[PDB]
Design a binder for this molecule. Structure first.
Ligand code: F43
Ligand SMILES: C[C@@H](OP(=O)(O)O)[C@H](NC(=O)CCCCCCCCS)C(=O)O
Ligand SMILES: O=S(=O)(O)CCS
Ligand SMILES: O=S(=O)(O)CCS
Ligand SMILES: [Mg+2]
Ligand SMILES: [Mg+2]
Ligand SMILES: [Mg+2]
Ligand SMILES: [Mg+2]
Ligand SMILES: [Mg+2]
Ligand SMILES: [Mg+2]
Ligand SMILES: [Zn+2]
Lengths: 442, 548, 246, 548, 110
């Protein structure tokens, strides 16, 4: 092991699963369930067969309000879904016994597609998933109905939209949780451009699972961006463990202690008490009626404060059952804890800064929107290196219906397909089990 | 009757247009030209004023060893030297682009839902009219909530405003007509019927930001400017807190969830934001041009007015400046909108199809492409062989390739009623022309032409798209002159022959049906002539804030 | 909890606003109906509008966090989220913008607080916002001359006072009555006239404003002379700087 | 002597600047203001002529319940209402951005190597002068090879030209001096020696395309238009075939291998091509401003002319229009270049550093950051507490946070000679200010500020960068007003205190040392005043081609 | 040593740092290899060329099977070399940002 730390791991009901797991068994570089989640998200596509049929029958292709009069084609795609999906699958797979999955949902109106992992091991990136899926369905619908050479371009427009005149698949009737590689704010950002409403839809609004999927994706991007290499690696792994995997039941026990009557401020007081009790912090200096805390382990102080920040979001936005105030919790949990202790807040001020601009861009005229439309690649919320967005996902899991741009509005096609996948829907379960399995190989 | 280009040839040259020989070298070079003489004098005055040599007719080779020709703007009786059609020298052409770049369409349907659901407040015709008075003060750059704001000078921004339209006649008729693009007034009956059915009960804003701002900044500024002032006017007109969580849903709706940009952003090698020419698909260019709602009894006139709009914007400003620059590409575009030449060839093909098949009644297949595109291609080429003055006028191979193939592709689509077989006709015309005369265009003209046939009906990822959805960023089309505006004409052609009210986006069609634009989109070639004559008055000038 | 370093009156007042055990001084009595009228979101006798159905009508899946966190009463009912916003004069108003948001997230549950130089806001579920708003308006969070309830057109934190000692208000929502020494609220927080004005009591005098203020100034207590509070700010700067490097 | 802002506060208000009390509500609202009155009348005229309501002082809330103030442009004696400093109403501000957007620097080093080694022709000062005469005909849009070219009107493009510079004095003196930026004429001796050492025998072009084209198009047009006319002029002046294989090496050299854009392109959420404001790094902005070569005895003046340049371009035009729009951000910027306020605070900090350390003699460490930035922050904040008129003038917290922190960060960098510790002093300033007044800026002002301390000395991928290389696309800086133009000042401060000729790119510094520019970059705040008075004459207007 | 960082013709006067990187290439490459690898003896390769002037670096394949794309190669390499150079010479907090600029350039402004 490069690090001596161990953590105890729990399920989403607060019961112990595995004691004394080395920290690196939760590393995205080592844990096989994080590998399966990441390769899963690269390779999964949702296909809206009903949407393709309707766009064709109305000639409404190429983006909002677009229509080509005279181009209508009336094809019985949903009534012939099984045949079309099987013919698509034979083109998507590499061999007959690989990991390609094509599964009808909603009486044939939707399909879950998982493009074979092997196409990615010989690819630079992840766009093979929507591009191989799209052509296999365009060719399978043309072949099902013997669509002519003169009309077949309308089936391509109904599936993939106005691409390549537009850079995006504008108007497409497929969807993925990733977005195109040209939209990255920097190299290494693709696992960050995943809408918070898609994480909350995939995990069926289960708060701890939404926070764990969001943290796994954000901290795995930190490795791909190089942020978690060398001096910073342990900070990132302890953030993953304590903020997103409920290590030591810290988040769960703080929420239990403050759920009935608690505020952000009460959660802070309990966390500082816990950190002192565990030896993570100690009094360095007495001022006048004021203790200055110090730590000999900044990465562990940061992780404990991160677990408190998640618990504070769950208390604060859980009590309102309204996600908007997560921007304020992310700000003032950090601002209050620095003046309460004399130690730096989570991510050395970067969560607090991300929350200042997030608060502004979720309550102003200039851009942004509601919490659910943000993501780790959004210009407003890219600044903290994984410690902010998982709290936004927990908050939108807890919203009871205050958002216009809710997961039901923005992510219905993703919910139907991606919640079918057990490791996307319940990641906390599979990453803990895998960590326990490899615990003696670290 | 005379071919349609005879009057213009007779004006250009002393010989009858059939004559085979002429005289050269005796015109005194640039001194034959009023416009070149203006430029020589101006160059001397500029160089002296600034202390650096500039325009000099004795640098490089001596222009005007042949006739420097006037051009007839087609459908007009205006004749001008081609320099008056260069976009730098023609304020109508610059304003046409500014009126597109500074426009965005922005729904009020999410916004009115946020008001009813989140805020719990009512929306009615009354509250919409109050909002429109508010946004027409705010949009040009004036304040509605804070103290001590400083504002734009109203007369510098007199071209900026917000109008609405809706398919619901009883909301439309109740708002102050000052704010409404009235579909029933603007469109003949069957097109009004189609357009109101597409829009339904949706209500859409047409926002025009100031030309002086669009010129100072870029196209990607338009939907941001529009959303800031919609956001202020929602706060003021509906009594929100001036910046609460719900304010952010009006921002996301106005900037993303119910915006229609005129153009989408471009890839990095040609990096540009939204509302730049390369992002405008050919179907939207045809719907921006308003010839379809005026000239609907004549599908050739509608299609060729869209070819004039797109040849100028896509070859002269886009490819000839944004993507290159310098002297640029005036005459690669003027070929498509002067001397009634494309008109002659396209009227021939429309007649051929109407007599043989009936408009839109040919089979939509390769037999119809082979018949009509070959017949019209040979007609156009024969006119260059029978009239030496016509060949000397459209002197560059690329100009003739674009004109002959636009008439073949438009005629093919008048037969089939489908743009994709029109596009196959365009590529077949190029291959016939190349064999007939053993040349086609400039060194790189037929990149797209040789990929062309195979990509018309492909379905692959970056190859397959109906023509109406292609544009200047479709991969094969991203570089070269003499195609894009003509493809916008082919996209218009089957819809004009069908009587369709729009080509690709009904909102875009309605959004330019508005006489408060600075440029008159119903008569694009008329407006190019007015600008050539120095008679068009553009917006955006700084005279009011500069000395006398 | 310690809340804030320092040895000035301003420091202690910052701590007392955050500390939910410190009893905020009540300076004035306002009726429930009048809090509703000043907020301006509903008329007296109007039922609470809803944004979604009551939680008990929703039957949601098993979630350990939702089960452990008690919803506030307006969240159980499905109430809209509404707001109240205050502007605080830099001429020694008792509360000030960061003091508000820090104290609101120590005292109040389910709270979205925002801080700006000229305005500070809390957004929460409507019936709970009315209960918090009474406390914000009745106690030493509020002075009716040096603080203003303002949903828009907030200018005035940084302006000179008028001759009555009142902060500027572009919309004149709080009018000082020379005949009583008292301020009335004549408009609600968005600026619409009220049927009948609300008594907000007498402005605090100079001495009591200096006792209760949470702003540092050269003509009150200067922050540069609260050397223990400046030391902790500089510590935080240096520790974030070192942490970000290695 | 009085604080430098006293004269302005006495002009703005009847009371003494220390007076705590005033009178409101008695000025007649907008009727107190000459400019608002001009606007009300013009709104009446615009709405009547076009048939749609526009500016109306009664929509929303009534401006002018307090004094609507004049502002002194700092370093001048000109007092104007703030509307005259809005970029829409100020032709000097629009031309300052057009002169940056339409410029590119293009080497002749690879080009001369292609001539010598591939064409086998000699290059000498004479051949360079013949090429320069050719390119100064062609660059504004005139022809050198083909027959029947139509061209731009020389007087509409009189601002377009090409000059060169080189560090070899004897080669510089042999090229015709009408085309040469003379480094020894424009720079004081010591800076001239630094700059000529950096350039050495390299020869570089400064190419300026027409402002009328830049305004019609965008920034990413500039290097393309430059390269097209460089390419034509290399064909004509060195006698190439007009289009042979070597022609492509001149195109790749001018468009990619030896081009220096003013700005790099932006990511897709804020998609823009090159030469837009968001791509201009802070060190280039400091180098474009020419105060360094004129005011070099006074490091405060050099640093705050860079702050004015940056606050206008990055807050008013970039953040306030390209990235938002509307009434926009005039006064968030004017706070950094009016009333001599930032001047008063920065002279105090420069004197404080002179006394304690000596310029550039302090240790480059955190002890210096804590000492200087805390002292200067408390000086600035005490001024707003001592002078109520000063606080009512800079009424927005963000305006005060930017002004106080700029003085603190420029003074820290005057002490250490290093911009990175200047930048840490800017963040400490904000933390101290926030605790002193229990407020800082607008809702979103300190996103970068709270990330700030930790990111000053970070070395990670999208975190670590010397301040000179940062710009409006550094992630934490990409959204918010009140920072970018002050960072350009902090980047200039240690180099002005050191007496360095440039901050980050010596070629950018030389490229703007040219009196043939339309805007005078040596005196940015003087030009802003001239435009506010409606006395600046911009390029690009269309009067010659529109009705009299 | 010249402060020439950030792109063509760019320089920051006063920021020069004179570090013997090529003379200490072995120690720097080994310290970078320890950060780049996932486990000892995996498929990470760091090999000096040109007497220490250049290095060939092959980032371990496993970092890619947990990545969306391929930018981890330059980004993990660049940071491991920046930290190895800083640690070799004990470069200070104040000056380390110049090592970052010299390795990866004007990113993320460009
Ligand atoms: C509606 C918002 C929320 C939002 O997203 N933007 C607003 C309004 C927007 C509008 C106001 C124009 C109008 O009145 O119609 C514009 C001009 C942007 C635009 N659309 O053109 C603007 N703000 Ni604002 N905004 C400003 C400022 C401010 C200060 C004003 C505090 C005060 O005491 O006066 C506060 C933030 C703070 O408290 O720190 C502020 C808030 C707000 N800002 C509150 C309205 C406040 C109120 O109800 O009065 N701005 C400033 O602090 C100074 C510069 C000023 C900007 C105009 C310019 O730069 O000239 C303007 C910048
Ligand atoms: C955040 C982005 O907007 P969205 O979420 O719609 O992509 C971005 N907009 C901005 O960053 C606006 C920046 C200037 C105005 C606000 C900040 C200062 C106020 S004083 C954008 O338009 O790409
Ligand atoms: O001669 S080339 O075809 O290269 C260019 C024609 S404008
Ligand atoms: O009020 S906000 O801070 O959102 C905007 C300031 S212009
Ligand atoms: Mg004690
Ligand atoms: Mg008209
Ligand atoms: Mg007209
Ligand atoms: Mg009571
Ligand atoms: Mg002292
Ligand atoms: Mg001059
Ligand atoms: Zn422009």
């Amino acid at each position: 092991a490069k690090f001596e730390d161990k953590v105890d791991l729990y399920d989403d009901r607060g019961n112990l699963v595995e004691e004394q797991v080395p920290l690196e068994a939760l590393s995205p570089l080592r844990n096989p369930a994080i590998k399966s989640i990441v390769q899963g998200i690269k390779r999964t596509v949702a296909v809206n067969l009903e949407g393709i049929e309707n766009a064709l029958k109305t000639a409404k292709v190429g983006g909002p309000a677009c229509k080509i009069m005279g181009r209508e084609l009336d094809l019985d795609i949903v009534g012939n879904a099984e045949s079309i999906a099987a013919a698509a699958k034979e083109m998507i797979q590499v061999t007959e016994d690989d990991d390609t999955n094509v599964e009808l949902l909603g009486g044939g109106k939707r399909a879950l597609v998982q493009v074979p992992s092997a196409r990615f091991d010989v690819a630079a990136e992840y766009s093979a998933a929507p591009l191989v899926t799209a052509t296999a369905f365009v060719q399978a619908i043309i072949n099902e109905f013997d669509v002519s050479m003169y009309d077949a371009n309308m089936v391509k427009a109904a599936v993939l939209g106005r691409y390549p005149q537009s850079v995006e698949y504008m108007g497409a009737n497929i969807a993925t949780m990733l977005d195109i590689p040209q939209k990255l704010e920097g190299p290494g950002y693709a696992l960050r451009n995943i809408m918070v409403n898609h994480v909350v839809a995939a995990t069926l609004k289960n708060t701890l699972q939404a926070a764990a999927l969001s943290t796994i994706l954000e901290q795995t991007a930190m490795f791909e961006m190089g942020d978690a290499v060398g001096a910073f690696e342990r900070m990132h792994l302890l953030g993953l463990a304590y903020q997103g995997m409920n290590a030591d039941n810290l988040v769960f026990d703080l929420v239990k202690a403050n759920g009935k009557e608690g505020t952000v401020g009460s959660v802070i007081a309990d966390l500082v008490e816990r950190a002192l009790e565990d030896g993570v912090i100690k009094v360095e200096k007495e001022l006048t009626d004021y203790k200055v805390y110090g730590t000999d382990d900044l990465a562990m102080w940061n992780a404990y404060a991160a677990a408190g920040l998640m618990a504070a979001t769950m208390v604060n936005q859980g009590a309102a059952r309204a996600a908007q105030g997560v921007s304020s919790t992310l700000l003032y949990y950090n601002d209050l804890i620095e003046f309460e202790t004399g130690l730096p807040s989570v991510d050395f001020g970067k969560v607090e800064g991300t929350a200042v601009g997030f608060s502004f861009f979720s309550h102003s005229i200039y851009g942004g929107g509601g919490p659910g439309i943000f993501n780790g690649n959004h210009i407003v919320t890219r600044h903290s290196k994984g410690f902010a967005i998982p709290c936004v996902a927990a908050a939108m899991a807890l919203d009871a219906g205050t958002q216009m741009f809710s997961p039901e509005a923005t992510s219905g096609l993703i919910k139907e397909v991606f919640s079918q996948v057990d490791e996307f829907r319940e990641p906390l379960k599979y990453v803990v089990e895998a960590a326990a399995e490899i615990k003696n190989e670290i | 009757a005379d071919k349609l280009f005879i009057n213009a040839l007779k004006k250009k040259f002393e010989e009858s247009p059939e004559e085979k020989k002429t005289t050269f070298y005796t015109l005194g070079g640039w001194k034959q030209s009023e416009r070149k003489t203006e430029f020589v004098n101006a160059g001397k005055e500029v160089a002296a004023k600034r202390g650096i040599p500039q325009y000099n007719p004795d640098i490089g080779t001596p222009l005007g060893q042949r006739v420097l020709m006037p051009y007839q703007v087609s459908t007009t009786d205006t004749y001008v030297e081609g320099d008056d059609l260069h976009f730098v020298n023609n304020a109508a052409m610059q304003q046409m682009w500014d009126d597109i770049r500074r426009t965005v369409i922005v729904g009020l349907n999410h916004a009115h839902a946020v008001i009813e659901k989140r805020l719990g407040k009512e929306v009615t015709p009354e509250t919409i009219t109050h909002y429109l008075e508010t946004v027409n003060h705010a949009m040009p750059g004036a304040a509605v909530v804070q103290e001590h704001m400083v504002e734009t000078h109203p007369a510098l921004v007199a071209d900026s405003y917000v109008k609405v339209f809706t398919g619901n006649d009883e909301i439309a008729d109740e708002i102050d007509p000052a704010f409404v693009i009235d579909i029933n007034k603007q469109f003949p009956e069957d097109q009004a019927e189609t357009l109101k059915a597409e829009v339904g009960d949706g209500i859409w804003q047409v926002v025009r930001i100031p030309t002086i701002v669009s010129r100072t900044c870029d196209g990607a500024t338009t939907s941001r400017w529009s959303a800031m002032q919609i956001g202020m006017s929602m706060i003021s007109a509906y009594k929100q807190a001036a910046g609460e969580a719900a304010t952010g849903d009006f921002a996301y709706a106005a900037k993303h969830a119910e915006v229609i940009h005129m153009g989408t952003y471009l890839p990095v090698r040609r990096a540009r934001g939204e509302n730049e020419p390369g992002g405008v698909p050919f179907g939207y260019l045809a719907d921006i041009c308003q010839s379809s709602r005026v000239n609907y009894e004549d599908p050739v006139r509608v299609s060729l007015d869209v070819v004039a709009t797109g040849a100028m914007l896509y070859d002269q400003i886009w490819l000839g400046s944004y993507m290159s620059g310098g002297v640029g590409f005036t005459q690669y575009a003027t070929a498509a909108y002067t001397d009634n030449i494309l008109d002659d060839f396209t009227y021939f093909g429309k007649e051929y199809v109407e007599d043989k098949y009936g408009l839109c009644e040919a089979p939509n297949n390769m037999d119809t492409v082979l018949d009509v595109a070959t017949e019209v291609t040979f007609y156009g080429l024969e006119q260059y062989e029978e009239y030496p003055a016509l060949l000397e006028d459209q002197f560059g191979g690329s100009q003739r390739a674009a004109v002959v193939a636009a008439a073949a592709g438009c005629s093919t689509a008048f037969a089939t009623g489908n743009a994709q077989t029109g596009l196959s006709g365009w590529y077949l015309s190029m291959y016939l022309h190349k064999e007939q005369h053993s040349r086609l265009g400039f060194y790189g003209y037929d990149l797209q032409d040789q990929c062309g046939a195979s990509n018309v009906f492909s379905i692959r990822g970056d190859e397959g798209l109906p023509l109406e959805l292609r544009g200047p960023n479709y991969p094969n089309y991203a570089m070269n002159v003499g195609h894009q505006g003509e493809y916008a004409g082919i996209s218009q052609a089957p819809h004009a022959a069908r009587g369709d009210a729009f080509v690709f986006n009904p909102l875009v069609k309605i959004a330019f049906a508005d006489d408060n634009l600075v440029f008159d989109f119903t008569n694009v070639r008329g407006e190019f002539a007015k600008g050539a004559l120095r008679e068009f008055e553009p917006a955006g000038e700084r005279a009011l804030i500069t000395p006398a | 909890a310690q809340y804030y370093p320092g040895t000035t009156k301003v420091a202690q007042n910052r701590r007392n606003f955050c500390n939910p055990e410190y009893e905020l001084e009540k300076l004035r009595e306002i009726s429930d109906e009048d809090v509703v009228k000043i907020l301006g979101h509903r008329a007296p006798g109007e039922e609470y509008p809803s944004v979604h159905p009551p939680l008990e009508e929703m039957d949601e899946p098993e979630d350990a966090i939702r089960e452990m966190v008690e919803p506030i009463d307006g969240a159980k009912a499905g109430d809209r989220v509404r707001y109240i916003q205050f502007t605080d004069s830099m001429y020694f108003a008792p509360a000030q913008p960061y003091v508000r948001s820090r104290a609101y997230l120590c005292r109040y549950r389910g709270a979205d607080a925002g801080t700006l130089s000229g305005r500070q806001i809390i957004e929460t579920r409507e019936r709970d916002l009315e209960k918090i708003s009474k406390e914000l308006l009745e106690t030493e969070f509020f002075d009716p001359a040096r603080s203003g309830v303002r949903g828009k057109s907030v200018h005035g934190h940084s302006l000179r006072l008028d001759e009555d000692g009142m902060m500027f208000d572009m919309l004149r929502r709080q009018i000082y009555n020379k005949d009583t020494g008292r301020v009335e609220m004549v408009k609600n927080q968005i600026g619409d006239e009220l049927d009948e004005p609300v008594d907000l009591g007498e402005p605090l005098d100079e001495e009591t404003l200096m006792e209760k203020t949470t702003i540092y100034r050269v003509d009150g207590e200067a922050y540069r002379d609260d050397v223990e509070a400046v030391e902790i700010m500089q510590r935080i700067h240096v520790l974030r700087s070192q942490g970000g490097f290695n």
